[PDB]
């Protein structure tokens, strides 16, 4: 029940995405607690140190959920520019020409699938391209 | 409870971004305190020296949160003009031609990621460009 103010930085999450759940706690929490939404992307929690505690818990646990990191997957055989059109015809993927490598972005579960699907599209063709040579 | 006036410069933050949280304190603070929003980008706090204290605390702590600094990352191998198109196809980046270097802007956490992602796109290609030479 201790009345205090607390600082919560909101990094990955849009601070107003959290409008419902932080203020809906005030329904249950009652008075004394205030939640502040600043487009400079922090959320200022001022109130009873237990209820703010959860919203340092909730957000910075929820701020984990939307975590988006990028990784460069090289391509030994196929052209990165094809794979960037194909994988984007199914549904963020950007191809780097120089190193022949595909930049991918998403949560670690989505960056699993495209990492398994790019290993098959990079599988080596057997000897037979669209071009063959016939000795007459 | 001392009634005073105080000067708060608001540097990085839009002074009207702080309309909710400074005036919502007046709800809890009560009378005697006044918060002034000047588009010349300061916020004049006149009132009880404890409640203004926090809003010198809050803002100049919040004014830290949106801190945006720029840095020039050189590029030894790749062209800065490519990396400026690629890194901007994922989502501020401006490339400098002469020194072959990319200007980047953002908070120190975002300027971490692009600094790790530019180290891979600058990694040296192994001997094999899009051009090879076949001796027949």
Curated annotation (Swiss-Prot), chains A, B:
Residues 2-66 are annotated as: N1. This is Secretin GspD 2. The chain holds residues 141 to 289 of 686 of the full protein. Encoded in a type II secretion system (T2SS-beta); this strain encodes 2 T2SS but only this one (beta) is expressed under standard laboratory conditions. Belongs to the bacterial secretin family. GSP D subfamily. It comes from Escherichia coli O78:H11 (strain H10407 / ETEC). It is found in: Cell outer membrane. Disruption phenotype: Severely disrupts assembly and function of T2SS-beta. Part of a type II secretion system (T2SS, formerly general secretion pathway, GSP) for the export of folded proteins across the outer membrane. This subunit forms the outer membrane channel. The lineage of its organism: Bacteria, Pseudomonadati, Pseudomonadota, Gammaproteobacteria, Enterobacterales. Forms a cylindrical channel with 15 subunits, each of which interacts with the surrounding pilotin AspS2 proteins (also called GspS-beta). Interacts with inner cell membrane protein GspC2 in the periplasm. Forms multimers in the outer membrane. The isolated N0 domain forms dimers that self-assemble into rings. The N0 region interacts in the periplasm with GspC. The S domain interacts with pilotin AspS2. The N0, N1, N2 and N3 domains are periplasmic, while the secretin and S domains form a channel that is partially inserted in the outer membrane. The cap gate extends out on the extracellular side of the channel partially closing the channel. The secretin domain forms a double beta-barrel structure; the outer barrel has an outer diameter of about 110 Angstroms while the inner barrel forms the central gate with a small pore in the closed state. Residues 67-126 are annotated as: N2.
């Amino acid at each position: 029940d201790e009345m205090v103010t607390k600082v919560v930085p909101v990094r990955n999450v849009s601070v107003r995405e959290l409008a419902p759940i932080l203020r809906q706690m005030i329904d249950s929490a009652g008075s004394g607690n205030v939640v502040n939404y600043d487009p400079s992307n922090v959320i200022m929690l001022t109130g009873r140190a237990s209820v703010v505690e959860r919203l340092t818990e909730v957000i910075q646990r929820v701020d984990h959920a939307g975590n988006r990191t990028e990784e460069v997957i090289p391509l030994d055989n196929a052209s990165a520019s094809e794979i960037a059109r194909v994988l984007e015809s199914l549904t963020q993927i950007v191809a780097d020409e120089r190193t022949n490598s595909v930049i991918v972005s998403g949560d670690p579960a989505t960056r699993d699938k495209m990492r398994r699907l790019i290993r098959r599209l990079d599988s080596e063709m057997e000897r037979s391209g669209n071009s063959q040579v016939f000795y007459l």
